[PDB]
Design a protein around this ligand. Sequence first.
Ligand SMILES: [Zn+2]
Ligand SMILES: [Zn+2]
Ligand SMILES: [Zn+2]
Ligand SMILES: [Zn+2]
Lengths: 223, 223, 223, 223
Amino acid sequence: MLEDLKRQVLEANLALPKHNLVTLTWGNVSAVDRERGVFVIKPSGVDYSIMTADDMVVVSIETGEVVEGAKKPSSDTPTHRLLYQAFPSIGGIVHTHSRHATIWAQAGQSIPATGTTHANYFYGTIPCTRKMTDAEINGEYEWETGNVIVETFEKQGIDAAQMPGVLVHSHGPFAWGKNAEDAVHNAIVLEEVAYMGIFCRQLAPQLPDMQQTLLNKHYLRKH
Amino acid sequence: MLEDLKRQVLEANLALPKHNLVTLTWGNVSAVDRERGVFVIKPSGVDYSIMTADDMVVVSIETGEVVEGAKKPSSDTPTHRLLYQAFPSIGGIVHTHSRHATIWAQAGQSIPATGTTHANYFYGTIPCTRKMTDAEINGEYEWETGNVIVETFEKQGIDAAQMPGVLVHSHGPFAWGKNAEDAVHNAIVLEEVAYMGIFCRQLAPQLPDMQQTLLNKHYLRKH
Amino acid sequence: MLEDLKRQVLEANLALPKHNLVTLTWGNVSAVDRERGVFVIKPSGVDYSIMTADDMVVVSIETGEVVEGAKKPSSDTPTHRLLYQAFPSIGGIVHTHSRHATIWAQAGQSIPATGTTHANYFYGTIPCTRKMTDAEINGEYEWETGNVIVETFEKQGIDAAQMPGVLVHSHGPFAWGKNAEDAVHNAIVLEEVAYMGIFCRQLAPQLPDMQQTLLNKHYLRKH
Amino acid sequence: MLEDLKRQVLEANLALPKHNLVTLTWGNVSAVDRERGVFVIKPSGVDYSIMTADDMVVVSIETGEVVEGAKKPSSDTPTHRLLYQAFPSIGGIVHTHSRHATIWAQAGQSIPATGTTHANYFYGTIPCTRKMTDAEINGEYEWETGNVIVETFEKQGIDAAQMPGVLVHSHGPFAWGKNAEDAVHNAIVLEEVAYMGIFCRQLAPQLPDMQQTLLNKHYLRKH
Ligand SMILES: [Zn+2]
Ligand SMILES: [Zn+2]
Ligand SMILES: [Zn+2]
Ligand SMILES: [Zn+2]
């Protein structure tokens, strides 16, 4: 029904393995069409090497019901859905277990801004969520994963339009952007700064976060 | 005699270098046919770039005798054989010296479950065996390697159907699955969580294992 | 106007992703034509996969004005320009956020010469600049970035003709050479010794810099 | 004059970049023909992408004089020559600055045998030479590099036929084998165990070397 959108999502999903952000069939990308009140996401149970635009599922932003698609949508759909409702300014969402961002997630630590690379895409510390409670995990898990992300941002007063990424404790990174592609680009940068953050800490364990002035210069410049 | 099986094993063996789990000619994959009472394994002394389905050797589960094949079977055949007898629920076995899982093996340490990535494929700590005794090593080595793996699981009360992987002290990883391919996939995940485990420990040296509830959620969900 | 130069710069810019020194559209290479009093640099807002020789911008060494080009020049142009004026003996300049050199930059640490690999291309410690002041950052930023590099070399008495590289605190590496290509080669070596420096320090935290005699032997030999 | 030999050396040299053991034009492989009293080595000043069998230089084992070749031989030729004279049982020599083996070399540390991977190709600790003296470095450098390697083996009573590799302090690895190809394979394994050695030490800083029985089992088995 939104072929050009299914195209953008399809291509973004195929970009995941190309940029070495995923292995096997992990990861998923989706894009939203606000006026349509629906979002398109990667299908569940489909290899990237077989995946076609027609496999992309159409889901209702409001009810989470599949508006079009023969395939089952990604099991992470509720999280995507929740985030679209919570963050009005986002147009695309990426979820992967990219190695280095996931290392930070598993460590339960937030990625501090120590470089201009990071400053160009994330306005400050990339937050790692608190652990989910036993209740949240055994309840509507994916949806709750979304709630934990949103709570993290509200409690810490972080603007989602200025921080297109987050780490889910013991799980992995979630990133987003203006559209499917933009979302994928933010995901690849999140992985890059995660990688560099590990080793810059090793070289300088008592390294202070970058100068606020430098952070501002680079983030405010773009956007 | 089981061309379709020799095909599955051949392709799984060719997948090893493609997924960067092996170098030169290290590694080997095999698949079993219970009703036939035989398993098919990679040949010894054959480059992956030359390897053909006909090179796959057929071996007796009960006697370890080669039922069909011009080439000599992998020197690890006894280990595979032992594991098939010991673990009834397995249909394929992978052995490699994939770098990161091997780093843990050489360190003689078990890979703790610190993420959902790990939880999705291994139900808990991926065990590293104790060192083999001088007698075991100088006896029927490969077979003894199998016995050490099995003892590890029995002593620690770990169900092989829920933990498709193990690290052999000072040696390397062994993984298995429902079939040759499934076995290969578990092998690649074992390498991924081994990689991430190294660095998540570095970021958080006193990091506790993941929440049991989270572990259960992810493992019990699949399967 | 200098097609053969735009060719050299174009090809050098396309070499950046090929040598895994860049991601997305980061990085930029330029080459100068002293007699012409102009330098050619990568355009801003152009994917490497689309980039053509015609996209290369021509800029005035003296005024920084674009002498020819439909596209906007890289935002790092002022830095390049400043460096050409400051260092007469350089013919090409490379700027990237290559992961490992950037890790050192973010750590705010200089890369010590601990090997012959390093000695072959950099005559001594590869310097990391001091942090830029709030004023410098909020002023003519790129130009000031150049001034900080130059001050680093003058204060520390380092000859730019013998040290074709520098790390900008919290930012990334800048490298240069006799021409666009030579500049790119120095950039790739800077990344290699940055990578090895991290881990050689890990293996030997109290490792002294390499023998001066060895350093001299290798650097003075070439050149 | 020995086209089939120039072929083996050519192909081995082209294998260096393919196995990611080299960058730019670093590294060199050579093979010897004892009965002929000559060895063939990679030429100096030739990109791997242009390199042809005819570019391979023929050198006298006894005098180090070029018996055939339009191109200048690798600057490491004296080292190769010395090693051929010193170690009668070797038929090929590889020299690279492969990242991880070089990290150990720069750290001035020997790679301890902590795994079967290592045991399969190197019978024990892979030695790192002592630092060269100012005199050795400023004398016939490459030849002296060879003498330091040989002294290392004699002083420590290590059989070159059982240890096809060595690390030259602050420099890089040298490996050898029965022929050009065998030499290249040993070089790639040296890099693999160097990589794993770094991180296995990190996981277990007080890790003892592998069981002698295990070391013997694996090395004595092959060969
Ligand atoms: Zn996930
Ligand atoms: Zn093995
Ligand atoms: Zn930059
Ligand atoms: Zn060298």
